[PDB]
Structure 1
Amino acid sequence: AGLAVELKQSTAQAHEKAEHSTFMSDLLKGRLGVAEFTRLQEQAWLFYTALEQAVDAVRASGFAESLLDPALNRAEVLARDLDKLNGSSEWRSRITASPAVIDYVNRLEEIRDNVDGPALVAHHYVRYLGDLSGGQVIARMMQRHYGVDPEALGFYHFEGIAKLKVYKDEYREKLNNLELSDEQREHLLKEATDAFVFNHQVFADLGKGL
Structure 2
Amino acid sequence: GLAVELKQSTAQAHEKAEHSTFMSDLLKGRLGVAEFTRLQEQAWLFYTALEQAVDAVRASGFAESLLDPALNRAEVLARDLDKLNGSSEWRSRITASPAVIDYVNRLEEIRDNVDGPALVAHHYVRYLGELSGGQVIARMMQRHYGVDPEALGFYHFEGIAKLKVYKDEYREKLNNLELSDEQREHLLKEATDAFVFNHQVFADLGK
TM range (shorter): over 0.9
1:203 aligned residue: 202
Q: Distance in 2 between matches of 1:80 and 1:197?
A: 28
Q: Distance in 2 between matches of 1:25 and 1:82?
A: 22
Residue 140 of structure 1: how far off its partner (Å): 0.5
Q: Distance in 2 between matches of 1:36 and 1:133?
A: 22
Q: Distance in 1 between matches of 2:162 and 2:21?
A: 34
Q: Deviations over 1:4-41 (max 9, x none)?
A: 00000000110010010001000000110000000000
Q: Deviations over 1:147-187 (max 9, x none)?
A: 00000000000000001110100000000000000000000
Please, what TM-score do these two structures have when normalized by structure 1?
A: 0.98
The count of aligned residue pairs is 207
Q: Distance in 1 between matches of 2:40 and 2:161?
A: 25
Residue 87 of structure 1: how far off its partner (Å): 0.3
Q: Distance in 2 between matches of 1:119 and 1:159?
A: 26
Q: Deviations over 1:108-138 (max 9, x none)?
A: 0000000000000000000000000000000
Unaligned 5+ runs, structure 2: none
Q: Distance in 2 between matches of 1:163 and 1:193?
A: 28
Q: Distance in 2 between matches of 1:15 and 1:138?
A: 15
Q: Distance in 2 between matches of 1:187 and 1:91?
A: 36
Unaligned 5+ runs, structure 1: none
Residue 190 of structure 1: how far off its partner (Å): 0.2
SS state of the match for residue 135, structure 1? helix
Which aligned segments of 4 or more residues in structure 1 are displaced greater than 4 angstroms? none
Residue 104 of structure 1: how far off its partner (Å): 0.2
Quote the sequence identity (%): 100
1:162 aligned residue: 161
Residue 61 of structure 1: how far off its partner (Å): 0.1
Q: Deviations over 1:55-101 (max 9, x none)?
A: 00000000000000000000000000000000000001110000000
Q: Distance in 2 between matches of 1:163 and 1:153?
A: 18
SS state of the match for residue 38, structure 1? helix
2:77 aligned residue: 78
Q: Distance in 1 between matches of 2:15 and 2:157?
A: 24
SS state of the match for residue 179, structure 1? coil
Residue 144 of structure 1: how far off its partner (Å): 0.5
Q: Distance in 1 between matches of 2:173 and 2:25?
A: 35
Q: Distance in 2 between matches of 1:16 and 1:108?
A: 24
